[PDB]
Amino acid sequence: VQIVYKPVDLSKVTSKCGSLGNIHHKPGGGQVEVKSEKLDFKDRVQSKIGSLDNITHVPGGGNKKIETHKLTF
Amino acid sequence: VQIVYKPVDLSKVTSKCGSLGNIHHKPGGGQVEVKSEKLDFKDRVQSKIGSLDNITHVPGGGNKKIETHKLTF
Amino acid sequence: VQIVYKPVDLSKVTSKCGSLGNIHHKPGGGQVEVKSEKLDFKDRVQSKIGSLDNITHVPGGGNKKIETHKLTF
Amino acid sequence: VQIVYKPVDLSKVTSKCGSLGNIHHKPGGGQVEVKSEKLDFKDRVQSKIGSLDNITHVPGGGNKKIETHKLTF
Amino acid sequence: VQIVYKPVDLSKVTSKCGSLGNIHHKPGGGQVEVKSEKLDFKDRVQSKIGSLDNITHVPGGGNKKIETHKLTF
Amino acid sequence: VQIVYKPVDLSKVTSKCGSLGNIHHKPGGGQVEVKSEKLDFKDRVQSKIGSLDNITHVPGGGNKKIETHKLTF
Amino acid sequence: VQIVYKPVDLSKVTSKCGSLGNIHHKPGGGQVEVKSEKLDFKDRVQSKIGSLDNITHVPGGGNKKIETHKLTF
Amino acid sequence: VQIVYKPVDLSKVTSKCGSLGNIHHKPGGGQVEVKSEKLDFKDRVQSKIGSLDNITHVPGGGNKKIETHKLTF
Amino acid sequence: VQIVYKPVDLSKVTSKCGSLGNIHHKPGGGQVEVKSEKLDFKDRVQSKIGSLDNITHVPGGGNKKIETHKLTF
Amino acid sequence: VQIVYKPVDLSKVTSKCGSLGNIHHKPGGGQVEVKSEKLDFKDRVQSKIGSLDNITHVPGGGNKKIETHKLTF
Incomplete structure (x- = not known):
């Protein structure tokens, strides 16, 4: 038996941009309240x-x- | 038996943009409240x-x- | 039995940008309150x-x- | 039995940028309060x-x- | 049995930048309060x-x- | 001419209550934006x-x- | 001419309450923005x-x- | 001419309360921004x-x- | 001409309370920004x-x- | 002409309280920024x-x- 494996790949993942600019992010923080008792995390x-x-x-x-x-035998 | 594997691929994933600009993000934070007791997470x-x-x-x-x-035998 | 493994790959992951600019991030911190009793983390x-x-x-x-x-036998 | 393993890879991960600029980060620190009793961490x-x-x-x-x-036998 | 292992790799991880600039970080420190009793950490x-x-x-x-x-036998 | 003025008044404005209780007020703050140019307040x-x-x-x-x-002459 | 002025008044403005209780006020602060240019307040x-x-x-x-x-002549 | 002025008044403004209690006030501070140029306050x-x-x-x-x-002549 | 002025007044402004209690005030400070140029206050x-x-x-x-x-002639 | 002035007044402004208690004040300081140029205060x-x-x-x-x-002639 013979296995063969030649995955070839070219790619230019391009990302051009001139100027993003004046981004703004002005949130008014709200409020949260959680009320649990127990949990059991695993794995x-x-x-x-x-x-x-x-x-x-x-x-x-x-x-x-x-x-x-990936590959398996 | 013979296996053969030559996955070839070219691609120019292009992303041009001149200028994004003046993005804004002005949220008024609302409110949340959760009330649980127990959970058991796993896997x-x-x-x-x-x-x-x-x-x-x-x-x-x-x-x-x-x-x-991927591939399997 | 023969196994063969030649995964080849070229790629220019490009990221051009002229000038990001005047980013701003002006949050008003809200409020949080959690109330648990117990948990048991693992693994x-x-x-x-x-x-x-x-x-x-x-x-x-x-x-x-x-x-x-990856690969397995 | 013969195993073979020649994973080849070229890539120029490029990151060009002219000038980031005047970034700002002006948060108003909110408030947090947690109230637990016990936990048991592990592993x-x-x-x-x-x-x-x-x-x-x-x-x-x-x-x-x-x-x-990775690889396994 | 024969094992073979020749993982080859070239890559120029490039990071060009002209001038970062006038970064600012002006936080108003909020407030925290935790109230636990016990825990048992391990491993x-x-x-x-x-x-x-x-x-x-x-x-x-x-x-x-x-x-x-990595590799295993 | 004679003026006379004897405004008499009794009243027990009563307000009894046993116990108000557990009032709550949990708003999620929305958002406002005004855009004026000028005004001229007075008097x-x-x-x-x-x-x-x-x-x-x-x-x-x-x-x-x-x-x-009140009264006037 | 004679003016006379005897405004008499009794009143017990009563306010009884047993116990207000556990009032709460949990707002998530929203957001505001005003944009004016000029005003001229007075008087x-x-x-x-x-x-x-x-x-x-x-x-x-x-x-x-x-x-x-009040009264006037 | 004769003016007379005898404004009499009794009142017990009562305020009884047993116990206010556990008041709470947990706001998440939002955000504000004003943009004016000029004003001229007076008087x-x-x-x-x-x-x-x-x-x-x-x-x-x-x-x-x-x-x-008050009173006037 | 004769002026007369005898404003009499009794009042017990009462304020009874047993015990206020456990008041709390837990704000998360938001954010403000004003941008003016000029003003001229007066009087x-x-x-x-x-x-x-x-x-x-x-x-x-x-x-x-x-x-x-008050009173005037 | 005769002026007369006898403003009489009794009042017991009472303030009873048993015990205020455990007041708390736990703010998370937010943030402010003002940007003016000029003003001219007066009077x-x-x-x-x-x-x-x-x-x-x-x-x-x-x-x-x-x-x-007050009074005036």
């Missing part, structure tokens, strides 16, 4: 219990190239 | 229990190229 | 119990290239 | 119980290239 | 119980290249 | 140009007794 | 140009008795 | 240009008795 | 240009008795 | 240009009795 958990977290995530240039190469 | 969970989280996610250039290459 | 947990954490995450140039190369 | 936990931690994370140039190379 | 924990820690993390040039090379 | 003005002002005005006991006594 | 003005001012005005006992006594 | 002005001022004005006992006694 | 002005000033004004006992006694 | 002005000044003004016993006695 690859992520979570958020109450969060007033505003973001400004301005990258000049945003691109993500993902290639999950 | 690859993600979650959000209460969240007042505003976002500005302005990338000059947004593109994601994804190729899940 | 690869991450979490956030109450968070008023604003962000400015401005990179000139944002790109992430990810390739999970 | 690869991370967490945050109450956090008013604002960030400015401005890198000129942001890119992360990740390749988890 | 690779990290945590944060109450934190008002603002950050300015401006690197001219931000890039991280990560390659977890 | 006993009061006003409000833009106001997000919530109130809780709970008096145990609310009564106002008003008697404008 | 007994009061005003408010933009105000996010929440109130809790809980008096045990609220009563105001007003008597504008 | 008994009061004003407020932009104000995020929360209040708790809890008096045990709130009553104001006002009597503007 | 009995008061004002406030920008103010984030929270208050707790808890008097056990709040009452104000006001009597503007 | 009995008071003012406030920018102020983040929180208060706790708890008197056991709050009452003010005011009587502006």
Whole structure:
């Protein structure tokens, strides 16, 4: 038996921009209240219990190239 | 038996823009209240229990190229 | 038996930008209150119990290239 | 039996930018209060119980290239 | 049996920028209060119980290249 | 000529209450924007140009007794 | 000519209450923006140009008795 | 000519209360922005240009008795 | 001509209270920004240009008795 | 001509209270910014240009009795 594996790939993921400019982000923070008692997390958990977290995530240039190469015998 | 595998691919994922400009984001934060007692998470969970989280996610250039290459025998 | 493995890949992940500019981020911090009693975390947990954490995450140039190369016999 | 393994890869992850500029980050810190009693962490936990931690994370140039190379017999 | 292992990789992770500029970070520190009684950490924990820690993390040039090379027999 | 003036008045303005209780006031603040150019106030003005002002005005006991006594010759 | 003036008045303005209780006031502050250029106030003005001012005005006992006594010749 | 003036008045302005209790006031401060150029105040002005001022004005006992006694010849 | 003036007045302005209690005032300070150029105040002005000033004004006992006694010839 | 003036007044302004208690005042200071150029005050002005000044003004016993006695010929 012979296995063969030659995954080839070219790509120019381009991101041009002249000038973003005057971005603004002016929130009035509201209010949150959680009321739990118990939980039991296990085995690859992520979570958020109450969060007033505003973001400004301005990258000049945003691109993500993902290639999950896999194989099994 | 012979297996063969040559996945080829070209692509220019282009993103041109002159100027984004004067973006604005002016929220008045409202209000949240959760009332639970218990939970039991397990095995690859993600979650959000209460969240007042505003976002500005302005990338000059947004593109994601994804190729899940897989194979099995 | 023969196994073969030649995953080749070229890519120019480009991120051009002239000038981001005058970004602003002017939040009025709201309010949070959590009320739990107990939890029991285990085995690869991450979490956030109450968070008023604003962000400015401005990179000139944002790109992430990810390739999970794997194989099994 | 023969195993073979030649994962090749070129990539120029480029990040050009002229001038970021006058970034601003003017938060009014709100308020948080957590009220727990107990927890029992174990086995690869991370967490945050109450956090008013604002960030400015401005890198000129942001890119992360990740390749988890793996194999098993 | 023969095992073979030649993971090759070139990449220029580039980060050009002309001038970041006049960054500002003017927070008004809010308030936090946590009220726990007990916990029992164990086996690779990290945590944060109450934190008002603002950050300015401006690197001219931000890039991280990560390659977890692994193999097993 | 004779003028006479004897305005007499009794009154018990009563306000009994046992227990008000658990009043709540949980608003999510909306948003306002005014855009004027000019005005010219004069001679006993009061006003409000833009106001997000919530109130809780709970008096145990609310009564106002008003008697404008006047006369002229 | 004779003028006479005997304005008499009794009143018990009563305000009984047992127990107000657990009042709450949990607003999420919204947002305001005014944009004027000019004004010219004069002669007994009061005003408010933009105000996010929440109130809790809980008096045990609220009563105001007003008597504008006047006369003219 | 004779003028006479005997304004008499009794009043017990009563304010009883047993126990106010557990008042709370938990605002999430929003946001304001005013943009004027000029004004010209004169002759008994009061004003407020932009104000995020929360209040708790809890008096045990709130009553104001006002009597503007006046006369003219 | 004869003028006469005997304004008499009794009043017990009462303010009883047993126990106020556990008052709380937990604001998350928002944000303000004013932008003027000029003004010209004159002749009995008061004002406030920008103010984030929270208050707790808890008097056990709040009452104000006001009597503007006046007369003219 | 005869003028007469006998303004008499009794009043017990009472303020009883048993015990105020555990008052709290936990603000998260927000943020302010004013931007003027010029002003010209004159003739009995008071003012406030920018102020983040929180208060706790708890008197056991709050009452003010005011009587502006005046007369003119």
